Design a protein around this ligand. Structure first.
Ligand SMILES: N[C@@H](CCC(=O)N[C@@H](CSCc1ccc([N+](=O)[O-])cc1)C(=O)NCC(=O)O)C(=O)O
Ligand SMILES: N[C@@H](CCC(=O)N[C@@H](CSCc1ccc([N+](=O)[O-])cc1)C(=O)NCC(=O)O)C(=O)O
Ligand SMILES: O=[N+](O)c1ccc(CS)cc1
Ligand SMILES: O=[N+](O)c1ccc(CS)cc1
Ligand SMILES: O=[N+](O)c1ccc(CS)cc1
Lengths: 217, 219
């Protein structure tokens, strides 16, 4: 049984798959991709999108981070269930992971790259989204309840981008959304998460360089 | 049936049509409620506070929003007939991949064909045909994307066929010329009662969009 993950270290999408694999206790080979110089392997495995992450299981690719996490859930179904068994609860978990997928990366990218009114609107919507997510969390330890679940996996990687969001967006997420930050730190107490996520400083530095190389600031 | 099943929808919505087909394929009698998107009902706003969009499937008073998530819910709840997804995890991942591709591409490219002008429109026409061709390649020689039976990708995609006269007329396209296998597939789908009963006529969607374009000052 071979498991390989094509990834790029600061990608929140790849981090999702890293976490799912670690949480299931699945040993795998991580392969770092240069997105400026995509490998023949990456191009062969994801011809449609040419993006990471790509999960390769016994030579067969699974593209799209959340689809890969669901695949992991369905194949390694012995322990640590990432989705609820009840259909309605499963639909809700999918709904919120979908919400994260649609909002967070894009709003964050606009925070880090856009300017003026687009930037302002992105900041506002970003905080609104975090607050909606806080509301959904309620007084649960994780979105998954007492254990990490699909939504936690979908969402917590974006925490690694928080210094970038706060610095370039002039936000103080800590004071606006303390429930959210406390939740993220709880996730970071889990080995599966800790070992999958780079530090906020490394990501901040990477994004700073990215901006400087895009002629932003 | 003891269950209450209600669908909040807007008749020409490809997204709502997915849920209609899924319910019909399971043989579920449901209450359809037409929504005016310019005058959304209190029920719609209550059931989908996050997106305020249709379709919303309401099962025993609980809402399931997002069309593909609703189709999956229907599959998991009514799991003793006409399975809409494969059992093999890898095949399931591939079906999800292609449904996702449809979700990311088709509606927005079609919208641009129907409402854009100039270079944006020409670009959207090109990308649209390219996407249909990629999907055609995935279909291969199978009867449906799901194989011998209608599947998740068929449900995700066939509603867009109802917009084809609109795409062809507003975009100056001949999709059957470009993609004959695709069109033959869609027509096969439309021969199934579950699909036929769920989908409006192309002419009606065309008339609707023609009018909308006029209202928006598009031409
Ligand atoms: N929907 C996909 C999204 C994955 C994705 O966006 N992957 C990015 C890397 S993470 C996001 C990202 C992209 C680029 C930079 N960058 O510094 O240039 C940083 C982060 C990618 O491979 N892009 C390749 C390409 O388009 O060429 C999923 O969930 O898996
Ligand atoms: N991702 C969602 C997308 C659903 C969606 O886009 N719903 C639209 C109607 S279908 C797309 C559509 C919109 C408008 C027209 N039209 O002719 O005016 C046609 C089709 C909606 O409720 N819009 C309300 C709003 O945004 O406020 C899903 O898959 O369910
Ligand atoms: O800082 N960013 O979030 C970011 C900047 C530029 C890209 C390349 S499209 C992607 C992400
Ligand atoms: O023709 N269209 O695809 C279309 C036109 C207008 C809207 C709502 S702004 C949505 C879709
Ligand atoms: O063709 N249609 O637009 C359509 C089909 C079926 C229903 C459910 S009564 C509603 C609308």
């Amino acid at each position: 049984d071979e498991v390989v993950l094509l990834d790029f270290w600061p990608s929140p999408f790849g981090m999702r798959v890293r976490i799912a694999l670690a949480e299931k206790g699945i040993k795998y080979e991580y392969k770092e991709e240069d997105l400026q110089n995509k490998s023949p392997l990456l191009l062969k495995m994801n011809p449609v999108h040419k993006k990471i992450p790509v999960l390769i299981h016994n030579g067969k690719p699974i593209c799209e981070s959340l689809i890969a996490v669901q695949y992991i859930e369905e194949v390694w179904n012995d322990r640590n269930p990432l989705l609820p068994s009840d259909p309605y609860q499963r639909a809700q978990t999918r709904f919120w992971a979908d919400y994260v997928d649609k909002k967070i990366y894009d709003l964050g990218r606009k925070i880090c790259t856009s300017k003026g009114e687009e930037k302002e609107a992105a900041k506002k919507e970003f905080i609104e989204a975090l607050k909606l997510l806080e509301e959904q969390l309620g007084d649960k330890t994780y979105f998954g309840g007492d254990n990490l679940g699909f939504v936690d996996i979908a969402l917590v990687p974006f925490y690694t981008w928080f210094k970038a969001y706060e610095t370039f967006g002039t936000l103080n997420i800590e004071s606006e959304c303390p429930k959210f930050v406390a939740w993220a730190k709880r996730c970071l107490q889990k080995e599966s998460v800790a070992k999958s996520l780079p530090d906020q400083q490394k990501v901040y530095e990477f994004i700073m360089d990215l901006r400087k190389k895009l002629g932003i600031e």
